[PDB]
């Protein structure tokens, strides 16, 4: 399932790229001869006018052939006869279509609706504070209501998240916080965490103490704690939060546990032994919380705007990553090869539909970006050729053209072997 999913993903991506190249070329009166989809022998070919459409065996890549690209042919439809501006346009047609496809599919997926976690919409209530964290260190008691941070007035958890990420980007350290508890506006000083890298303020929302899943073969599974059921007490201890359940199982450390559960209306006292699991030397129950979300649907204009700025954001992120790797900041092993994208496609196949859309858009934009970096025999190399020819005013020497093509072929082959061995190494781990 994952393999064919990756195959159709790469097929539609290359289809979009070559289709954009094809329309953009057609908009400048050039004849197209070959419309290869992939590589290897043509698995099937159909002819329609000059469009000899065909799909080949190896779906790794995809190639197109025009009429009179570099040959000294003076026919009006010849690509070489066209001015360097038009040649640059044909060069840029493909990745432009890739980017527009990514932005439009992001707009559609945002319009359709995403299952945003429900805890992101209610007003902020601190239902639990992690032990010996920043919130505990300042003195944020559980059950309080945060009302002001710095600034930006905060109402829901989304406002808090945006405020903290904005403060982290601004590089501020101390921030005034106005907290409410029984109606006193306490003023405190909070160290701004670098949430960009991952660390968080250690604030937990109120979560209902209801089980949504149980691991197969877990001791709770052996007892018979089905998913979707609610629990009152642990050995007589009153608990109103699933994080209280987490605290109780953490402090159990292996003692006998008498869970008093409401089996859809009946009281059951189930005995369990969450001893030190040999996998990690810790309490094991194999039980999962009941995650509750809500589907959010965005109108078309706002969905388009959100897709637009999200696209700008992660495109800037990809540009920064490219600059880092070209400067040696990040090791080359983090790139995404065909096997890596195939395995992430399989993970999305196990994930869901919105996963399909989101990571399809992600690989599309990543490939479009890759098709712009200046490399010979790449969608981002003929732009360099046309630019230098236009500014110099004369065509590149034929021997120099052949050497250009040869070194480009060499370097692209080496990079494919490099990504293959990197993917094999990733498969090993």
């Amino acid at each position: 399932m994952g393999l064919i999913a990756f195959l159709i993903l790469i097929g539609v991506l290359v289809w979009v790229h070559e289709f954009g190249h094809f329309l953009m070329a057609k908009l400048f009166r050039v004849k197209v001869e070959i419309f290869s989809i992939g590589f290897g022998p043509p698995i099937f070919r159909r002819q329609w006018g000059e469009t000899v459409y065909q799909i080949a065996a190896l779906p790794l890549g995809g190639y197109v052939k025009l009429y009179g690209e570099e040959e000294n042919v003076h026919d009006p439809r010849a690509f070489s006869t066209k001015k360097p501006w038009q040649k640059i346009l044909i060069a840029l047609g493909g990745p432009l279509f890739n980017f527009l496809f990514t932005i439009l599919v992001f707009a559609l997926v945002y319009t359709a609706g995403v299952e945003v976690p429900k805890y992101l919409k209610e007003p902020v209530v601190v239902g639990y504070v992690q032990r010996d964290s920043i919130a505990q260190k300042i003195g944020i008691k559980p059950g309080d209501k945060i009302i002001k941070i710095n600034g930006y007035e905060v109402r829901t958890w989304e406002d808090l998240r945006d405020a903290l990420i904005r403060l982290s980007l601004d590089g501020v350290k101390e921030t005034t916080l106005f907290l409410e508890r029984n109606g006193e506006v306490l003023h405190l000083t909070i160290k701004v965490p670098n949430v960009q890298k991952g660390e968080e303020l250690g604030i937990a929302p109120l979560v209902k103490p209801v089980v949504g899943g149980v691991k197969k073969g877990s001791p709770a599974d052996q007892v018979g704690i089905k998913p979707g059921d609610l629990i009152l007490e642990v050995n007589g201890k009153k608990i109103n939060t699933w994080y209280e359940l987490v605290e109780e199982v953490r402090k159990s450390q292996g003692k006998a546990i008498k869970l008093k559960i409401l089996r859809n209306g009946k009281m059951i006292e189930k005995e369990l032994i969450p001893a030190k699991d040999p996998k990690t030397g810790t309490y094991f129950i194999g039980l999962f919380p009941k995650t509750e979300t809500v589907v959010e649907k965005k109108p078309f204009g706002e969905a388009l705007a959100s897709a637009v700025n999200r696209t700008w954001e992660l495109t800037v992120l990809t540009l920064k990553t490219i600059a880092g790797l070209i400067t040696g900041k990040v090791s080359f092993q983090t790139l995404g090869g065909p096997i890596a994208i195939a395995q992430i496609a399989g993970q999305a196949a196990q994930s869901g539909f919105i996963p399909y859309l989101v990571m399809m858009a992600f690989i599309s934009l990543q490939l479009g970006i890759f098709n712009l970096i200046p490399l010979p025999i790449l969608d981002g190399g003929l732009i360099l050729l046309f630019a230098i020819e236009w500014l110099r005013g004369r065509p590149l020497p034929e021997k120099f053209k052949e050497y250009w093509q040869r070194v480009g072929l060499a370097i692209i082959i080496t990079l494919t072997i490099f990504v293959f061995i990197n993917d094999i190494l990733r498969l090993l781990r």
Partner: antibody
Framework: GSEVKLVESGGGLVQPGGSLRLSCVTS????????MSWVRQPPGKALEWLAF??????????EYRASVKGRFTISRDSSQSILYLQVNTLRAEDSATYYC?????????????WGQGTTLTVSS | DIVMTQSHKFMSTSVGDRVSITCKAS??????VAWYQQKPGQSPKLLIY???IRHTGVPDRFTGSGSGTDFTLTISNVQSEDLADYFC?????????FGAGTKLELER
């Protein structure tokens, strides 16, 4: 104003089986707002955390290494920015450099500023 | 309890080179790890916390990385002022434990 500064006192030579109190004088920061600890560094040995004490909003509660619980006691002065450590039943293995340290406020206690340390030698 | 094992007691390097000091935890500690530097006769000094966050004032040459059990502190372009002892520390669970330390030896 003045940068964070910690100065320990009370070290020296003490016979086995005795008792003493080490002191740590702090300056440059609000004393009642930071965790304090008495991590020790034996000669040619790894650092050994001994205890830490929480802030005012957390009731000044203490946490101890299980091996030293009931033997070592950390505490703060009531009206001055001085941290104390009472030690009894001294043995030759307690001979080390004892460091007083101020911790940051991030997630989970780590030690962002260390004092110069004071050396204790326990022998007959 | 949690034991921090530094496999290397000594490590050789030259000025301007890059050194990678490894640190292995007895069990999963996530990212609740800090790193310190101690020069002879001086107190330790925090360089990295949360596995990868550099402290304020720490040069860009010091980088931390790793997750789970095999954390690593990489020092690109070793300067002469980096001859010191470097050790890790975990704060995932109590009691807090430190590594045995790693001394930087110069090649010649």
């Amino acid at each position: 104003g003045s940068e964070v500064k910690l100065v320990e006192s009370g070290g020296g030579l003490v016979q086995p089986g005795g008792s003493l109190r080490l002191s740590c004088v702090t300056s440059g920061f609000t004393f009642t707002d930071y965790y304090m600890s008495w991590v020790r560094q034996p000669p040619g040995k790894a650092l050994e955390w001994l205890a830490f004490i929480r802030n005012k909003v957390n009731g000044y509660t203490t946490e101890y290494r299980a091996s030293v619980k009931g033997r070592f006691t950390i505490s703060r002065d009531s009206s001055q920015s001085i941290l104390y450590l009472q030690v009894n039943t001294l043995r030759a293995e307690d001979s080390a450099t004892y460091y007083c340290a101020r911790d940051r406020g991030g997630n989970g206690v780590y030690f962002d500023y260390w004092g110069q340390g004071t050396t204790l030698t326990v022998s007959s | 309890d949690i034991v921090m094992t530094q496999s290397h007691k000594f490590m050789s390097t030259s000025v301007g080179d890059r050194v990678s000091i490894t640190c292995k935890a007895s069990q999963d500690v996530g990212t609740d790890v800090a790193w310190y530097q101690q020069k002879p006769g001086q107190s330790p000094k925090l360089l990295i916390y949360w596995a990868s966050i550099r402290h304020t004032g720490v040069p860009d040459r010091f980088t931390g990385s790793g997750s789970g059990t095999d954390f690593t502190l990489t020092i690109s372009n070793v300067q002469s002022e980096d001859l010191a002892d470097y050790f890790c520390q975990q704060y995932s669970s109590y009691p807090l434990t430190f590594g045995a330390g790693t001394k930087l030896e110069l090649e010649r």
